[PDB]
Amino acid sequence: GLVPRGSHMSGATEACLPAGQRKSGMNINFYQYSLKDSSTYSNAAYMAYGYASKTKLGSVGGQTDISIDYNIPCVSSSGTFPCPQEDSYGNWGCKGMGACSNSQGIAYWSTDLFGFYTTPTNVTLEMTGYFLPPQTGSYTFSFATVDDSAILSVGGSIAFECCAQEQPPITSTNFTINGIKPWDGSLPDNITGTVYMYAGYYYPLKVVYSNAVSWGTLPISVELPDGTTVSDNFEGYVYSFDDDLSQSNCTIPDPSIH
Ligand SMILES: [Cl-]
Ligand SMILES: [Cl-]
Ligand SMILES: [Gd]
Ligand SMILES: [Gd]
Ligand SMILES: [Gd]
Ligand SMILES: [Gd]
Ligand SMILES: [Gd]
Ligand SMILES: [Gd]
Ligand SMILES: [Gd]
Ligand SMILES: [Gd]
Ligand SMILES: [Gd]
Ligand SMILES: [Gd]
Ligand SMILES: [Gd]
């Protein structure tokens, strides 16, 4: 057969070939999320698109270093220092700092999240960009843990529409990784989703992340088809393009036959 037969029943992930000026990194949009609201982010509709119905706080572009690791302050005898969560104890202190005088349960202001001055204790953010696979094959994306609620979506009409990165979010709830905070209880660690990708195509990528209280954590990784792992720093893999809703050929519904 002169040509590949194509993935079974339109099974391939939709990708894109934007013709515009490529920019290194992801765009991060920040939206309001209420301190101690442990229910809003438990809804699929909210995590897929509803977050953008809340007040948009701001944005930062060109982000390649994408894992989230936010630590609240411990106001201690020696000054004020961020406390790794696993070092917090009692009611409460931080190991190597003694007792902390401040509440774990109030809002805290910090630039920890991509240099944007906001409240990482209570916020929802949206990461958008395109993932560029250097190798053809199966890619396994993972969250090592989720504090508090998160999704990852890959693919045209799943993350967002090709050449329309900056548009309001689409409604698809067909998440690649579903790390939505369960109504009852939590989820295991190392939650994963696999996508088969063709080298040199641009795959829309969306990560929506929310925290309601104190610590926030989202360590992001991908395992390449060659078995190596890229964690946190996605430089060389993630790019942004300004919208071009007029580029007619931008969507590749089936990269296996394109
Ligand atoms: Cl601090
Ligand atoms: Cl201590
Ligand atoms: Gd980082
Ligand atoms: Gd960094
Ligand atoms: Gd770092
Ligand atoms: Gd951090
Ligand atoms: Gd940071
Ligand atoms: Gd840091
Ligand atoms: Gd950092
Ligand atoms: Gd579409
Ligand atoms: Gd949290
Ligand atoms: Gd492996
Ligand atoms: Gd733009």
Side-chain angles (χ1 to χ4, degrees), residues 71-74 80-83:
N71 295 333
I72 61 174
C74 171
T80 300
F81 302 92
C83 185

Side-chain angles (χ1 to χ4, degrees), residues 89-183 185 187-234:
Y89 67 90
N91 243 322
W92 70 292
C94 190
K95 219 274 173 179
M97 315 191 186
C100 311
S101 64
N102 59 310
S103 180
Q104 286 197 2
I106 66 177
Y108 289 102
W109 279 258
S110 168
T111 54
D112 177 66
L113 301 179
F114 312 97
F116 180 72
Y117 185 67
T118 190
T119 47
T121 48
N122 62 290
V123 70
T124 293
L125 59 84
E126 172 210 73
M127 308 189 197
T128 52
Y130 296 81
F131 186 90
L132 181 62
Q135 302 166 349
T136 289
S138 177
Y139 285 74
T140 302
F141 292 88
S142 61
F143 296 149
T145 191
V146 181
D147 183 339
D148 296 356
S149 193
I151 57 84
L152 180 148
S153 285
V154 177
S157 322
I158 300 183
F160 54 88
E161 304 290 354
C162 292
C163 280
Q165 186 187 341
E166 314 178 82
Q167 293 297 298
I170 61 170
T171 64
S172 174
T173 51
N174 188 7
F175 311 118
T176 303
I177 308 174
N178 184 333
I180 295 173
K181 216 281 184 203
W183 293 108
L187 288 167
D189 288 352
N190 308 299
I191 317 170
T192 71
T194 70
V195 194
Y196 198 93
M197 285 175 151
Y198 297 89
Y201 291 94
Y202 289 92
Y203 289 79
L205 172 61
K206 179 175 66 180
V207 177
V208 177
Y209 164 80
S210 189
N211 187 32
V213 208
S214 56
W215 291 274
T217 321
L218 191 73
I220 305 171
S221 294
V222 68
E223 186 192 333
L224 272 45
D226 74 7
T228 57
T229 294
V230 174
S231 302
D232 179 31
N233 173 24
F234 278 66

